[PDB]
């Protein structure tokens, strides 16, 4: 399909399958959920009745005592020692098929174009590594929360946006569904656009 520009007014040709396909609600949600789960690290643990410091001696005899039968000071129904099902460090990452990941990414890109949240422009660069310059460049464009995607990563643009929370700078290869969804506006360079079709295929 045809992607219009706002600065050079130059036509761009892009496959409609990767930019004009329908929006799959179910597929995108699964990929987004999978991405969040993969961000976890699951560094937690408790002590079961075997790992609690203590001794296995019976608190009192089985019979004769007037109170409930007890077996150990570390039973889960006892104060200061227990946890019936203690947690262990676990991996929460889940598998997502390559095609499913690509399909969700294609679905997300198409809808950004439909909601005009995606803006394609020519090369986006800053002459000097100054956050002030980048802020001015984004101010006249009426953009405050933007994700800058460029074909080639340059330290000059990387340093300029480092201290800008609402602004992110990324490469085409390092593109994730969550970032595209989260950011209000996405700006893609002409080079950045081309690499997307090649990797998306």
């Amino acid at each position: 399909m045809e992607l219009v520009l706002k600065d050079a007014q130059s036509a761009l040709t892009v496959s409609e399958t990767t930019f004009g396909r329908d929006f799959n609600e179910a597929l995108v949600h699964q990929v987004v959920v999978a991405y969040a789960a993969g961000a976890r690290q699951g560094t937690r643990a408790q002590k079961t009745r075997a790992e609690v410091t203590g001794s296995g001696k019976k608190p009192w005899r089985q019979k004769g005592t007037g109170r409930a039968r007890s077996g150990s000071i570390k039973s889960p129904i006892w104060r200061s020692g227990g946890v019936t099902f203690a947690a262990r460090p676990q991996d929460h990452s889940q598998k997502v098929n390559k095609k499913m990941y690509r399909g969700a990414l294609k679905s997300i890109l198409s809808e950004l174009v439909r909601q005009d949240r995606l803006i394609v422009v020519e090369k986006f660069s800053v002459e000097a590594p100054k956050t002030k310059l980048l802020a001015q460049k984004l101010k006249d464009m009426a953009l405050e929360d933007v994700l800058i995607i460029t074909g080639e990563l340059d330290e000059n643009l990387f340093l300029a946006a480092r201290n800008l929370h609402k602004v992110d700078v990324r490469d085409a290869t390092g593109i994730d569904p969550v970032s595209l969804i989260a950011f209000d506006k996405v700006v893609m360079t002409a080079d950045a656009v081309k690499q997307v079709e090649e990797m998306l295929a």
């Binding site: 609600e25 179910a26 995108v28 949600h29 699964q30 987004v32 969550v178 969804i181 989260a182």
Partner: peptide
Amino acid sequence: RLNTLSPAEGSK
């Protein structure tokens, strides 16, 4: 929109 995605009915 990150607070608008929902799963398909019957998935859970």
